[PDB]
């Protein structure tokens, strides 16, 4: 929305005030952690894992049942993505844009959007290098 | 791609070999579970690999991209014509 | 009774590579003090002193082998005057580092502050291994070169 554009959209989740899991949820915390690790082992990033647990298994919030966030569980089990999920998706979008622009050299709008995406990638990589979530000398190759 | 997700899965968790000679070697035994071929493959070598897969009853996947694309998809900084997955890992 | 304290050691090449022999001026490294006035952990003859102001002498000064005639702990360089704190800016020089003193300067007319910095060349003894971004306490000494007027006293 706000970064890189005039979008002012407000759509988002509103987490509940009452944080305790519903009484009809009879899945133990260890089983939820096992589900999270099994989903990760099938190549699912934390967002998608949370969405499957919410849609199909009645787990509104993993943190409210297990006490831990999904990426924390994956880190404790050696399953966390090598590079953070949002940076992975931004890099993938930039790569697809560059592949498209290889043939479509006059798509100037896609060139503009690619500039925006790459600036976003550099700002995020800067953040993740600072909090030691990335190596130094991690380089985004176009 | 579906093939890209499954490939990265096996790059993290399974086992594989790159290159036609090592692929055909795993094919001559029963160790191979899937052979992935670039659209770049020279016709005679592609045909030989298909024949080996047909005799070994190993699934064969035709990659959309060329050996450069397949190499990049496998995380590698070099081209690979033929990939053979010998352990599927936690994929399928 | 002096020749009964004479002890010959061998030249070690990790120190003696200057085309002149590197030695402390304050002591004779060939003769053992009967009273152990200046002796390290391993029995070698090594001069060291306490600089005042409650600054502890580093263990590497007491028990190391480096020769540095500008080190405040093992030479005649003395600390007097200002004690300053700074962040290490460069370690490119041999035995000398550049530090930065960042501070806010107040402009009275605008009732507001300005970011300013000074840079000081400081002699660093081999007793310390400071890196870029480290905090250091330094003490003023006599001029040691054209720019150097301070000595590293502690590395935080």
């Amino acid at each position: 929305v706000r970064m890189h554009g005039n979008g002012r959209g407000k759509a988002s989740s509103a987490l509940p005030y009452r944080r305790t899991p519903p009484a009809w949820l009879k899945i133990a915390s260890r089983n939820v952690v096992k589900m999270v690790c099994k989903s990760s082992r099938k190549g699912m990033m934390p967002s998608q894992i949370g969405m499957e647990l919410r849609d199909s298994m009645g787990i509104a919030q993993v943190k409210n049942v297990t006490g831990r966030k999904i990426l924390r569980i994956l880190k404790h089990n050696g399953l966390a993505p090598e590079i953070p999920e949002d940076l992975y998706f931004l890099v993938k979008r930039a790569t697809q844009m560059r592949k498209h622009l290889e043939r479509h050299t006059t798509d100037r709008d896609t060139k503009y959007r690619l500039i925006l995406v790459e600036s976003r990638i550099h700002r995020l990589a800067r953040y993740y290098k600072r909090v030691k979530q990335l190596p130094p000398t991690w380089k985004y190759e176009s | 791609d579906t093939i890209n997700a499954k490939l990265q899965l096996v790059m993290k968790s399974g086992k594989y070999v790159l290159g036609t000679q090592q692929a055909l070697t795993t094919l001559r035994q029963g160790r191979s579970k899937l052979v992935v071929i670039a659209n770049n493959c020279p016709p005679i070598r592609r045909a030989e690999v298909e024949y080996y897969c047909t005799l070994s009853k190993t699934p064969i996947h035709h990659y959309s991209g060329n050996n450069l694309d397949l190499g990049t998809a496998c995380g590698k900084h070099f081209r690979t014509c033929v990939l053979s997955v010998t352990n599927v890992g936690d994929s399928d | 009774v002096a020749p009964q304290y004479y002890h010959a050691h061998a030249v070690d090449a990790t120190i003696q590579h200057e085309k002149a022999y590197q030695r402390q001026t304050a002591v004779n490294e060939n003769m053992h003090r009967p009273s152990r006035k200046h002796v390290n952990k391993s029995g070698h003859i090594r001069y060291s002193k306490k600089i005042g102001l409650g600054f502890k002498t580093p263990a590497k000064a007491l028990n190391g082998k480096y020769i540095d005639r500008k080190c405040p702990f093992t030479s005649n360089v003395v600390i007097r005057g200002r004690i300053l704190r700074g962040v290490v800016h460069s370690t490119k020089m041999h035995r000398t580092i550049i530090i930065r003193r960042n501070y806010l300067h107040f402009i009275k007319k605008y009732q507001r502050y300005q970011k300013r910095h000074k840079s000081l060349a400081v002699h660093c003894s081999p007793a310390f291994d400071p890196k870029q971004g480290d905090e250091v306490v330094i003490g003023q000494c006599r001029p040691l070169s054209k720019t150097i007027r301070y000595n590293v006293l502690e590395v935080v």
Binding site: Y17, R18, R19, T20 | - | -
Partner: protein, 199 residues
Amino acid sequence: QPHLRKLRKLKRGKPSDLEESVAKALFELEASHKTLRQELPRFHVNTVREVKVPRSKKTVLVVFYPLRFLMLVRKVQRALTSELEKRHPGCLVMLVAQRQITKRPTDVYKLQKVQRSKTSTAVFENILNDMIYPSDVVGRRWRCRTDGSKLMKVFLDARDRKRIESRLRAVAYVYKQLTHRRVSFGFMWNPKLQQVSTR
């Protein structure tokens, strides 16, 4: 004596009257009850206190247990408190985990290092949650009057009123005793829309 495995080893030498009675009740419950049979062999308590809530009848039995048994006690709290109340006539029993509080540091570098679960606000919230466990806090307000005073009001789900309203006064007084903070209770029948129930 077999029943003293249900206390900390410190109180097994010269147990107090109430501590020994609670230990005896817990020991008998660890055999009689079927739901409490699965959890109580690993559980033991620290102390038991009597609190006389003024301007009313009945006392409050405050049972202190180590915080490592928090999940154990949560899993069977509804059964355990009911059976203990069935043991002691004319007394309410409230199970409170023992929590340590790290006093607020006067230095910004120590302030960054304190375990957030050992802060006063977190500990007092968890103690009040212990006091009313089966119900959860549905909302919270601080009423700041013109005299400089601040009064905190805790709202519960109105569908839980018939089970907790009678205990609410004792809960408030015991929370005042343990935390030295005041708390008032209200009920809301539509917590999502902040609809307070007038009765």
